[PDB]
Amino acid sequence: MIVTPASIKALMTSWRKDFQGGLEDAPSQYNKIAMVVNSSTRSNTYGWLGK
Amino acid sequence: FPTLKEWVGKRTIQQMEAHGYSIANKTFEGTVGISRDDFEDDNLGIYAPIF
């Protein structure tokens, strides 16, 4: 039994980094209700014709 | 140089002077600012001639 200081013994560990991003957010559901459109200016003007 | 005068006796040792003048440089500045949104949403091309 090689008597070892606690500080040195603590360094004998393995980094696993498996819990990263574990707690995500609620799933996105806006794609069922909205349509994505782009823009290239201060605003976006929509126009359509009547029947 | 002193103007010539009549010579009676011995020469009169006169004196002249030297003048000086100094002008100090100055620093000037002028600046303007426009937001990134306003400069990038300009499709007309009206804000381009600022340089």
Look up residue B15 and give its amino acid: Q
B15 neighbors B1 (Cβ within 8 angstroms): no
Query: CB-side exposure of B25: number of CA atoms within 13 Å?
Result: 2
CA distance A11 to B5: 106
Spatial CA neighbour of B38 closest among B21, B50, B22, B29:
B50
Residue A20 contacts B where some CB pair is shorter than 8 Å: no
A42 touches B: beta carbon within 8 Å: yes
CA dist B10 to B6, B7, B13, B18, Å?
Answer: 11, 7, 9, 26
Experimental approach was cryo-EM
**Rounded-to-integer distance, Cα A7 and Cα B27, Å:** 62
Task: Say whether residue A44 is in contact with chain B using an 8 A CB cutoff.
Answer: no
d(CA A35, CA A32): 8
Give the span between the Cα atoms of B34 and A17, in whole angstroms: 45
Give the residue on B whose Cα is nearest the Cα of A44. B41
Angle at B34 between CA B33 and CA B36, to 5 degrees: 130
Note the resolution in Å, 1 decimal. Answer: 3.2
Instruction: Name residue, tokens 């126009």.
Output: A47
Contacting residues of A for B37, CB less than 8 Å apart = 42
> Nearest-CA neighbor of A42 among B25, B15, B27, B47?
B47
Q: Which of the residues A40, A42, A45 would you substitute to probe the B interface, choosing the one with the greatest number of B C-beta atoms within 10 Å?
A: A42
Flag if A41 and B43 touch (Cβ within 8 Å): yes
